[PDB]
């Protein structure tokens, strides 16, 4: 037990704008554009996409927004949800 730690963070750097903008059907072209390189989908299974962020400093708190996405085989923004801050 050390009293404190350096903070740790992970990908999917976004804004509340970055969620308020997009919506259903929006093509993966537009979405991967306006939201950036999507860094989380399944190598096997549906066109389901994920945006997750976390930050853990010095033994305190949790900042876990976990945005799940799907497209269809064609690619349609569809079946979307985030769970923010864990």
């Amino acid at each position: 037990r050390v009293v404190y730690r350096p903070d740790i963070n992970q990908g999917n750097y976004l804004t509340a704008n970055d969620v308020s903008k997009i919506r259903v059907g929006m093509t993966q072209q537009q979405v991967a554009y306006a939201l950036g390189t999507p860094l989380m989908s399944d190598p096997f299974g549906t066109n389901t996409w994920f945006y997750v962020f976390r930050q853990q400093p010095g033994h305190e708190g949790v900042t876990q927004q976990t945005l799940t996405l799907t497209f269809n085989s064609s690619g349609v923004l569809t079946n979307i949800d985030n769970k923010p801050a864990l």
Partner: protein, 782 residues
């Protein structure tokens, strides 16, 4: 028409390729114009021509004789340059060794080479090649060249300079007009590159004055044809001071203009200087590099207003990207765990871009030294607009610590004393220290081992040991019978990133028997309360000590073996716990630092001074083996081992558990039998050493390598004495109770670092003669 055609004297090309090379063949009416065609084709072969064409009847012989081959090497007259550089200036020039070498080529290449001499800015008068043909087809040339060397015959001239004195400006130059050499800090020589440099230098200077408009300037370098007229002038035309009044940005940015105005924080009525503005530019770029956008672009358009010298400022910035990092790849762990390599890291594969952070990890490495190469190659995946990927190629340097031991003695066994203190152990980072001495009277064990790594914190336990049987008896007794068993292990853990804190525990046994005639020993015995003898060499003692061992150290080390501008400190201390066989109070503190006066840092200066102080806790004193010793060492050279120090007198020792004959003089039976002043460097309970030198890789060493030969010229200072010292028993004897033991020594330190061991030649001329100076101006260490 011909029916047969035969060639010879080729040695290089088949008859088929040769016949298909020249235009004529068999099966066509060979007429005179075909003969001229052979003539002109041989001429036009370009690498070889010799037209000897005779068609008598129906037979055709086309004969081209070959100046090839040749193997000319004899680069003679190489007096300032290497012959291989000459070979380069052939091959890289296009005079490579594929050698046909028509006789014409001699003057052409000689003279293009002399051209290269001028390219140096230099000259060489004779350049001659001498045909030595080898009678297979080969030749060699005696390449004799006498030099016309011309490097610095400078002469400064400046025109248009009327807002300042030329010389104010000259000062900061690299290109200098042959000043007395003892002022040298850096370099002074000519080169067209030196030109371009100094040019830009003062350009920049003048414009960052606030002075704006000057840019017009042409080269005029007067050259008296002596190799020596180096007389150099350039036109200029001063521009306009402006006041910095007005700044504005064009933020094509994700939104940081708050932080921007925060940064481009400009006072009214300011005066312009390109310095601060270049700065602010850079500053903003850095503020954003952490933000991932590794690719902006700015044009700072200063609204130069005349009649007010207003440089209103307009800049314009474009955004970059957020997140790339996708691969963290290294080059060089040929026999190495890259585990530790990633241990020195803090940035993460898989986030957005603070380039600074990979930079931090790298420079952290480079602080660790042990390797010589920079590499941060950050490649972005073609086929994805993001996902740049940093690469790291560094060239390590080995460490092997070995010494060989055989002899040399007269009445004692062939010595096998071992120095092997190995480190960063090739497959790991782990380090071991073993100094095993087995010399015919002395079997002193030594262990000191440590893992750099136990945790993600990287903590380290120092497994360390010694076991010393130091007797060095005359026969078996009255000669300090001793055993000493000292055990200790230590951990250190900092979180200050530069300041280590050490705290460890140590045990030692120490055995005594057959005390000696040093009165201070008996005196310490009485300090403990132990009644020892005074004329008998019979006194014994054993101890088993429980002392705490705590340390600290500051660290900012620019390199490894040759760190620059070192800023690094050590704290060290020992204290005894309840339940031990010792009590004392001893402090010791050492310091070493650098300053490179060169900023190419070819010239650094050492700042090194150390401190050591010991006394006792309640009722007791600092034990004797814990005293500070010095002389003829790499803190003070010119003496013999630990020769500087106080000198202990002797009590009359005559009934001394066989006080020997012809042996142990200074108050023995055979010798004088009364009180005896003995000359014996005992070392004091307090020490502090200062030493100074200068880093200069001399031009007289072939500095074709800059990290294995080291060149020093040192001076030092010292005085060491007893603090718990009196004259009641040193009335007629010398007194050591203050800093009084001054010795001085100046000397050169001669070092070339070969991986296996250092050749430590050391002459120091010890000149501040304090009593007990037993000098040795040669200590050849390894």
């Amino acid at each position: 028409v011909v029916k047969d055609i035969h060639f010879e004297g080729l040695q290089r090309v088949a008859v088929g390729a040769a016949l298909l090379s020249m235009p004529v063949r068999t099966g066509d009416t060979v007429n005179d114009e075909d003969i001229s065609n052979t003539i002109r084709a041989l001429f036009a072969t370009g690498n070889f021509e010799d037209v000897r064409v005779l068609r008598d009847g129906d037979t055709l012989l086309v004969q081209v004789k070959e100046r090839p081959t040749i193997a000319s090497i004899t680069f003679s007259g190489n007096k300032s340059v290497k012959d291989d550089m000459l070979k380069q200036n052939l091959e890289a020039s296009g005079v490579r060794v594929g050698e046909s070498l028509d006789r014409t080529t001699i003057a052409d290449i000689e003279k293009g080479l002399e051209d290269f001499y001028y390219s140096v800015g230099k000259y060489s008068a004779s350049v001659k090649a001498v045909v030595t043909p080898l009678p297979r087809n080969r030749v060699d040339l005696k390449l004799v060249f006498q030099e016309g060397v011309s490097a610095e015959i400078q002469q400064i001239n400046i025109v248009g300079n009327h807002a300042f004195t030329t010389d104010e400006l000259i000062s900061h130059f690299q290109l200098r007009d042959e000043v007395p050499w003892w002022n040298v800090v850096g370099d002074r020589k000519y080169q067209k590159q030196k030109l371009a440099g100094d040019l830009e230098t003062l350009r920049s200077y003048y414009l960052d004055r606030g002075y704006a408009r000057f840019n017009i300037d042409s080269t005029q370098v007067s050259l008296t044809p002596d190799k020596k007229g180096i007389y150099v002038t350039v036109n200029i035309t001063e521009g306009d001071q402006y006041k910095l009044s007005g700044v504005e940005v064009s933020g094509n940015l994700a939104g940081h203009s708050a932080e921007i105005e925060q940064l481009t924080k400009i006072e009214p009525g300011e005066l312009y200087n390109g310095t601060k503005v270049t700065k602010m530019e850079d500053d903003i770029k850095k503020l954003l590099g952490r933000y991932g956008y590794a690719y902006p672009r700015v044009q700072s358009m200063p609204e130069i207003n005349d009649a007010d010298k207003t440089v209103k400022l307009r800049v314009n910035v474009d955004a970059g990207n957020r997140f790339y990092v996708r691969k963290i790849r290294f080059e060089g762990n040929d026999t190495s765990k890259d585990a530790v390599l990633r241990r020195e890291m803090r940035q993460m594969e898989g986030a957005w871009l603070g380039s600074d952070l990979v930079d931090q990890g790298k420079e952290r490495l480079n602080r660790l030294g042990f390797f010589e190469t920079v590499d941060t190659d950050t490649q972005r995946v073609p086929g994805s607009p993001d996902q740049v990927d940093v690469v790291y190629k560094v060239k390590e340097r080995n460490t092997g610590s070995f010494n060989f031991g055989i002899g040399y003695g007269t009445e004692s066994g062939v010595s096998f004393q071992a120095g092997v203190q190995q480190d960063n152990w090739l497959g790991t980072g782990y380090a071991v220290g073993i100094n095993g001495t087995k010399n015919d009277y002395q079997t002193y064990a030594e262990l000191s081992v440590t893992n750099p790594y136990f945790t993600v914190d990287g903590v380290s336990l120092g497994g360390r040991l010694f076991y010393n049987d130091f007797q060095a008896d005359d026969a078996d007794l009255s000669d300090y019978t001793n055993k000493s068993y000292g055990t200790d292990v230590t951990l250190g853990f900092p979180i200050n990133e530069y300041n280590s804190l050490r705290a460890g525990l140590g045990y030692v046994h120490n055995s005594l028997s057959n005390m000696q005639p040093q009165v201070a020993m008996w005196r310490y015995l009485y300090s403990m309360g132990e009644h020892p003898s005074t004329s008998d060499q019979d006194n014994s003692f054993k101890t088993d000590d429980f002392t705490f061992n705590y340390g600290w150290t500051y660290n900012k080390l620019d390199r490894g073996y040759f760190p620059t501008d070192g800023s690094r400190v050590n704290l060290t201390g020992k204290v005894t716990i309840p339940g031990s066989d010792n009590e004392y109070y001893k402090v010791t503190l050492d310091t070493a630092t650098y300053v490179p006066i060169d900023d190419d840092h070819k010239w650094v200066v050492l700042g090194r001074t150390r401190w050591g102080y010991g006394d006792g806790l309640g009722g007791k004193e600092m034990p004797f083996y814990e005293n500070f010793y010095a002389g003829g060492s790499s803190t003070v050279r010119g003496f013999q081992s630990n020769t500087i120090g106080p000198k202990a007198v002797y009590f009359p020792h005559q009934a001394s558990n066989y006080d020997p004959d012809y042996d142990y003089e200074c108050a023995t039976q055979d010798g004088a039998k009364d009180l005896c002043k003995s000359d014996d460097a005992v070392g004091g309970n307090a020490m502090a050493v200062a030493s100074l030198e200068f880093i200069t890789p001399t031009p007289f060493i072939s500095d074709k390598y800059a990290n294995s030969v080291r060149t020093s010229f040192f001076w030092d200072m010292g005085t060491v004495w007893d603090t718990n010292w009196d004259s009641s028993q040193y009335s007629g004897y010398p007194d050591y109770s203050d800093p009084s033991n001054i010795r001085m020594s100046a000397g050169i330190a001669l070092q070339w670092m070969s991986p296996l061991g250092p050749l430590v030649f050391s002459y120091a001329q010890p000149f501040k003669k304090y009593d007990g100076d037993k000098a040795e101006q040669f200590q050849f260490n390894i």
